[PDB]
Nucleic acid binder design. Structure first.
Ligand SMILES: [Zn+2]
Length: 40
DNA sequence: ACGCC
């Protein structure tokens, strides 16, 4: 019962911790299928 | 924030 780990487990999304996706698949995170590099 | 690998 790790109350200290209130969020950000392995189960849940690292980025935004929403619904049932993950930080691999996060729609908030700019995973644009076009090279979403810190440049363009 | 990845990754749960
Ligand atoms: Zn997310």
């Amino acid at each position: 019962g790790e109350r200290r780990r209130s969020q950000l487990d392995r189960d849940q999304c690292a980025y935004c911790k929403e619904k049932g996706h993950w930080a691999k698949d996060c729609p908030k995170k700019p995973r644009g299928p076009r090279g979403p590099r810190p440049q363009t």
